[PDB]
Amino acid sequence: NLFARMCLDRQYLAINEISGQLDVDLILRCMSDENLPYDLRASFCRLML
Amino acid sequence: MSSFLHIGDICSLYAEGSTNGFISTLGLVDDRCVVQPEAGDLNNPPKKFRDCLFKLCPMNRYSAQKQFWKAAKPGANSTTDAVLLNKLHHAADLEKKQNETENRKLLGTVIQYGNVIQLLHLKSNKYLTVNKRLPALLEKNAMRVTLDEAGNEGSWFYIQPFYKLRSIGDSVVIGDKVVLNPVNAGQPLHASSHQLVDNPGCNEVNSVNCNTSWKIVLFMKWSDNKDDILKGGDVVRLFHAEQEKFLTCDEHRKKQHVFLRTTGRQSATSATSSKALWEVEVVQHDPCRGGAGYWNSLFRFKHLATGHYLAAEVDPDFEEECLEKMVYSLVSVPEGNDISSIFELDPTTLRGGDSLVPRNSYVRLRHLCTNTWVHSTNIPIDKEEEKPVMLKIGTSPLKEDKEAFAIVPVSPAEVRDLDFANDASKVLGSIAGKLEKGTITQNERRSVTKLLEDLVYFVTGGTNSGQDVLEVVFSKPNRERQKLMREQNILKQIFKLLQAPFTDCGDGPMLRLEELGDQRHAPFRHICRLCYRVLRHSQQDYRKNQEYIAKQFGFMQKQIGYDVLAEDTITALLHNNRKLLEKHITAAEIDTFVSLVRKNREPRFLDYLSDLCV
Amino acid sequence: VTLDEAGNEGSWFYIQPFYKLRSIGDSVVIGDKVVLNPVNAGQPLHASS
Amino acid sequence: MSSFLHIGDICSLYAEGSTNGFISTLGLVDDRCVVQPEAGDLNNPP
Amino acid sequence: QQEIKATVTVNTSDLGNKKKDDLEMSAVITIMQPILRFLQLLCENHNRDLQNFLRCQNNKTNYNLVCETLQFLDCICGSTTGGLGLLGLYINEKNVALINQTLESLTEYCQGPCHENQNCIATHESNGIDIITALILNDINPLGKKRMDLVLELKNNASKLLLAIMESRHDSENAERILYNMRPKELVEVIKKAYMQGEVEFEDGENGEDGAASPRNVGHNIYILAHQLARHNKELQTMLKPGGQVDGDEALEFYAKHTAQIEIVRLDRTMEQIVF
Ligand SMILES: [Ca+2]
Ligand SMILES: [Ca+2]
Ligand SMILES: [Ca+2]
């Protein structure tokens, strides 16, 4: 949640280095993985957005 | 000539005998009666004379109120009473309305010896009561004389003659010496000689058999106590008409300068400050009589905050400038018995000389001693200041209609609130000073806790009803009371008190932050929680208070996590505030939050620094 | 600004206060300083140089 | 003492400010309004 | 009165938290009942001289016993807070007899067209008349669950007293107060409610031949009082008209067909209108 609120409204100063760890594939795999509770998946959704 | 006493008259009581002096009160937060002998006498009234005034009232019915009060406490648990809660609460309200109706109807009637009366303290709006079940403080076998807001059966008094000249059934004459006997106590009100330890010169007043007589000194007639008429003892603001500024007196360069403050506010009459309040006084032959206001009377203006008197005197600086006009300039003098402090009042329309002065009429001020007229000057008082806000005021022998003032009345409730704020600030400062050394007692803790509860109810604008004070929710709080709490240094004393227990003076702090989890510090946790509650209530939906509090953000960060309710206050401050979060946040606060996460890892710190960047 | 024998719509004036002491609805007192505004012109009567 | 204005009162108008003087007229044949500053003032009427 | 006011004990600890033999009558209180009985017997048979001699004795100082009795009733029944539906916890089994005696004595003060006594009682400074109206309207608890006959006697005596107040006078000087205390509605629902209780008790039979304190008789007295009051209240006149579309009027037609008006002339050649 802190990352998602940190990267709001075109903030490249955080996006440029946070995105280096969480690529689209990893976030999307966290999307599909139903084992995790839905709140973590929602946090992943907002982070990817 | 003299005359009889009447219901509704305002008068003071002068003790005479073993100890002589006017009966007064210590303050709004304290409920003790005091006779001060060295303040003055009949020929020289005390400087703070408006404290010593009482109002004559008839009996009040307290039966239904007694039934409601005497067991409103929790003592039983069934399920068969709420209907009569509502029923006899309505009954008590009806009784209050009936009391007010009979009080209005009976107003003006003559008081005779043997009648039963109640004394209402005008400054506090509290009745004078005697408690027969409680002993006196400094005396053992006396009774306790205090002040109660609503009164009770102890408020009733017999008015009885101290002289064999008068007899029961005779009307009471102004200047008579009487004896005040409570209905339910039977012991005359006694002006003891037991000096109060904490206030020097204060002598306790209690109920015991004695020979003390109370000389009734009139101050205002029942017919002259009209709200729609200017009268002595009122509080007003002298608002300049054309300049659109308020006449204030403020300290500068170790001296008091009276000036016309350059109010930058768009609204002229919105500038509500405690230093712009003036005490109107009508000059009379009797030093202890106030009277009403007439167009041809003589007036004095007294600064409410400092007590100084407004006067015009031969200016010492510009007189030297006259040899290198404005002959005299207004100043504030400490003494008010001189002839240089007296003023003449001039109407702005065709009003008869003998007519009463309307409450909020424009006027012109003429200095009687020099026969000059007041005038507004554009010369700044503070020359060295880059943005002057203090404009000099002088007087000129030439009269003109441009220079006029407005007598803006101030409601008594606002004055009561201001005095309550002053007293609360004083007692909070004293408590903080005592607590930073760790030499307090249990009664002081009770006093400060009930003071903080009263502060909560004062700022929130509500009334006590038995509901919890910590978890109470109100509507939009009173605005002017928030302004008062900011201006009267209540917030400063709250911060000092919050820093007090943990302050170190060379021997170590008297309390430890992580030690608050014990059961032995429950009252201290309660005090801290009440302090943070008043902070949160004060900062709500107000810009100036939020800006004032945000300066102490670095102080109030490091107390989070100890269940002192700093969480709610800090969250409210960061939530509904946008610009302050921009200009009072630096790397220090972020680093502090990061460290607090590192040492005491818990998600709510992460939420705290998450929601302050969005 | 001229003089007309019978007058017309230009003869009408607003009597208005020049001082903040007085307000609309207040009676006019002898010796007061006022402002003369024509009804249909809106420009106060000016004593030019 | 003073009093209020009434309909039907006869009064003069005295300009004050940049130029001060009583408002008057040039004559019966001329239809111009004139302020004459050097004629006099409140203490010395024209 | 002072003893009653000081020694009255209403437990208000059972009064602030819930629905989200003791102190026998004193001698100074017990002696009131013979005093009231004697002062009642002084005015039986409509003795006019002794009726108006108890209010103005034409001496150096005059003591008004009628006002004092009214104040005694007001204080014993619960003062102004009693008349707000709080009569239940002010009236117990001990003081029913005393209140009944006060009501009877007041009635015999007012029986016969003693205009001065009626004006004095109706327009007194205290609030006894509100207490009487509360006795008629509001129910009594817990007396209304155990002792029905005592409550019926209280209601009957209050009804008789209010009829005596409005006895043989059509002036609007005393009716407006009684109308101010109680609105026409509560009158109408009390009249209606008495009817069902009366019919239920009459259906049981077993020697129910016109009991003095029957709820039917109390409702009839209330109806007579409402009929007398209606001359100064058009709304009450409209509500008293029977045959309305609203159900429950059967009480209204029952009472309207058993009420008669006549018109007599007194010995001093004045006309009075009687409802019986
Ligand atoms: Ca005397
Ligand atoms: Ca003062
Ligand atoms: Ca003027």
Author numbering:
A (entry chain B): 738 to 786
B (entry chain B): 5 to 328, 350 to 639
C (entry chain D): 149 to 197
D (entry chain D): 5 to 50
E (entry chain A): 1868 to 1887, 1955 to 2210
Sentences from the paper on this structure:
One conformation, hereafter called ‘extended’, was observed in the apo- (ligand free) and Ca-IP3R1 structures. Two Ca2+-binding sites are identified within the ligand-binding domains across the inter- and intra-subunit interfaces between βTF2 and βTF1 domains. Another strong non-protein density is observed in the putative Ca2+ sensor region in ARM3 domain (R1582-H2192), which we assigned to a bound Ca2+ ion, and this Ca2+-binding site is referred to here as Ca-IIIS. In the Ca-IP3R1 and apo-IP3R1 structures, we found two clear densities where alternative W2639 rotamers can be fitted.
Inositol-1,4,5-trisphosphate receptors (IP3Rs) are ubiquitous Ca2+ channels predominantly localized to the endoplasmic reticulum (ER) membranes. IP3Rs play fundamental roles in the physiology of a diverse array of organisms as they mediate the release of Ca2+ from ER Ca2+ stores in response to diverse physiological stimuli. IP3 and Ca2+ are the primary agonists of IP3R channels and both are required for channel opening.
